[model samples]
Target chain A: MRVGERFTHDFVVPPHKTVRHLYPESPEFAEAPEVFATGFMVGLMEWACVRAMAPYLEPGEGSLGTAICVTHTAATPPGLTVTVTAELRSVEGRRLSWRVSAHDGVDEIGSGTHERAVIHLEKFNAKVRQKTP
Target chain B: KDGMRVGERFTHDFVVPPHKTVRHLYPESPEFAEAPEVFATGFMVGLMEWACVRAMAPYLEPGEGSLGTAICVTHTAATPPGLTVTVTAELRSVEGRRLSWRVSAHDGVDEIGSGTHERAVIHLEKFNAKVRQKT
Candidate 1:
């Protein structure tokens, strides 16, 4: 609801969340180093923003990720904890924007901008279900 | 150098298995445990990145590889397991080491996501050395 609101979240890097586990079906990906997967890093960023905005959302309201522009600048091996910091940067109607960054114990691993839209969860789910054949 | 062209395109697809769901994204986060079992946006982004990599594979030198630097995409629909998600990526631009792409994804039924992605070419050995120094 207010700009400058911020939240931080930390998660230990598990082996299952590493690149090798990203696409176990792919021999190419399975051969990748056992470092934090960029995909999961993106998820962590969204999770941090969701936590930051939880208090402002009304009952039955949830945010869905709409846009993300991030750089994975460093590799994080399994077992290290990653700290993600998300700051509310702007708000426009139902759309919220955030500036996010993450660091493992050793270095800043990711940073970027993200946008999400607040929606009535049930209504959104119903709409998606309509798409299912 | 056999670099990629501005309009080269590539496609990749994968069937959503149980493990690719939102709950599996971060099992440590209690919040996601009860979340829907559809495809996670994070993995969707990864699929797009995979397409981009394949699009440029023939252009890179033996020791060179690409790393994702930036991505901007929208998760438009929910996709459950058993459906295959297809990703299409087109090289949009190239600025020295930086490669930009226009990417999109679709589940069997609907267009699930789409956006732009950016990657930087790097020497695998040198990149690994730089990362090791950070440890």
Candidate 2:
């Protein structure tokens, strides 16, 4: 089994999750913070799945999720429940395909497909480990 | 309060989730139901939330206070595995603890689906408490 073959993962949207937020009293959605934050959490979830395939994949065999073509549709304030789910769809050269979805307590609000291209560990690190600091 | 009164027609559009998602599979299990890669229910819900907030943000004042409350939408059409979809939310009304909207979704030229969303302005702490109580 190589180190960078392929892998799959899934997770449920926990209950009482902060679904959306709003400030009715603000302007142009003041402090509108790009309306994004849970990404790091979702990324970690994806990371674990990639890590699980260590035995099958070559060392340092995963690539960061480069893009999230998301639609900022409904606004969920605190307390509303929601879940985001992803599934591995395919694997090619250095790329992995995913089917992503998001749901509130009763229904879905967003969904889309994503692509993650695999990268070599040393090569990827060499590009970043530049002693620029 | 009077600018975007009742029946106000507006469109708040948003794009797909900015992340990668995958489902865990087991070889021993059946090929099973193939979930649509193009679109997922969870992402749509996330999109609707973002759009609704962005749409309502501009109207907030320094102290008036408001926030995204709730959303109800449908993943009517399959969005296809690599394409991007847009959700547009329209403000429908405002009644004290409730703000309503007419929501819709699209992928390029195709009109995929539509639904309604609502938000209620709240003090941050109060909202957090309701969530904590559940736990």
Candidate 3:
């Protein structure tokens, strides 16, 4: 993908996307506020990048989120929509870099950088399958 | 009072479940529905954060809690369901109320991810109050 390309995606926060749902097995997380989980926010950012790169990818090619560095600045509760905006900043061979930020309608909740790698889905899946017993 | 020391380490194991897959990441996004059924980079980051929390449990007071402020992680491998993913976090610094950890994860067969995470300790009530003001 070329640098300077940009995309925006929006997601409404569901109860299942809250910190409590991040780890249903953890009582500690269940006790936390029912706000958007930072974990899921990272996924949202990646998803935005995935959407942005969709048109550029060739058949059988998919991207994997390789690296991310982000900060959760504010809390967003369920029902609010989080909009993630990603700008392609650099493209080094198969590695792509993006500058991303998020808003929960009322406040800016997150911002950071993310990196992804283009890969052959069939081959990647085969490699992962080999790791399984 | 003595606080958490640098080099304190915490480790935990988690079994990958269907709910933790990328498909479950954003239910609103149809794109993920067609994606592969593997451990998501997002939840993997959460696992690292969870490890950091457990590492600092003894240092935090009852009314105090920590919130993730920053994370930088590389998800290098894909892990499917039923695999036990082990996450480990080493306390690297404790500057005032801000704490940082060097974290990594391995899912049975391979090292799946690693990175650094930072959290800020705060009074739970006070932090919640400030967040409520934002609405």
Candidate 4:
């Protein structure tokens, strides 16, 4: 997997979504938080892309995620299905990155990059526990 | 006037806001992989503040809806959709019109986040007049 590459999933928008309920009370929906749903999807897609390229992620390849930078844009209504697609954007030994996006039936909701680093699950937690011991 | 201790704690449970999810193109499109619902950071901060203010009201003059400031707070943890978050606000000090509180947010078993918040009591109309100038 590499940058410019893409992966997608069947996403559904539920009625009674949180942002829909928050709108009348606050200005975020009219402004931005509504798009945070898209950031969540980007994080998810980045995770999937990491798994897909696990074979090339060096020896300690495993599910290890830490930190994410995201920006929210656009808003979607209720009962609409959204498709989230991700691409393998960067790979540096154990570290991996993805460019991700989301779209409901009507329009594109958001796009951003997510980063993950691979490490030995055993050693990672073991050393973390050892800090206390 | 009565006062709360530095470590004294107050707690309350909040219902999920109706439109709390980010609906853009989430869980809907193939671009994003995960679909966990999250509460907005601003809303979470406000909830914590409300709990603290409500706690201090019993000791203050009645009909006071004062919020001076929220010095700092960190939002850690992804809130699950439709889940109840039990938040606790602990008093740190009460100095005349200035009050301080330490607040924590939690969902189920995990300790989501904690922070120190500050507030100052002021006359309602006096405060509104200042805001009127800004506009």
Of candidates 4 and 3, the better by TM-score = 3
Best by lDDT: 3
Best model number under TM-score: 3
Docking band of candidate 1: medium
Model 2 Cα lDDT, one tens digit per residue, B21-80: 223221121221222233434445445656666666556544444444444444444444
Better of 2 and 4 by lDDT: 4
The sequence of per-residue lDDT tens digits that candidate 1 reaches over residues A1-133 is: 7899889988988768876577666654544555788899999998998877877888888877778888887788778899999999999999999999999988898898988888887887776566544
As a whole number from 0 to 100, the lDDT of residue B134 in candidate 2 is 36
**Candidate achieving higher DockQ, 3 or 4:** 3
Candidate 4, residues B8-117, lDDT tens digits: the string is 87887875543444232233433223223345454565466557656766676653445424334555554645567788988778788878777788867456677676
lDDT of each: 0.81, 0.46, 0.85, 0.54
Question: Alpha carbon lDDT of residue B56, candidate 3?
Answer: 81
Q: Estimate each model's TM-score.
A: 0.87, 0.44, 0.93, 0.47
Show where candidate 1 strays beyond 4 Å.
none
In candidate 3, position A18 carries an lDDT of 81
Q: What's the TM-score, to 2 decimals, of chain B in model 2? A: 0.68
Assess the local accuracy of residue B86 in candidate 1 as a C-alpha lDDT between 0 and 100.
90
**Residue pairs in collision within model 3:** none
In candidate 4, residue B113 scores what lDDT? 70
TM-score of chain A of each: 0.95, 0.56, 0.96, 0.64
Q: Order of candidates by lDDT, top first?
A: 3, 1, 4, 2
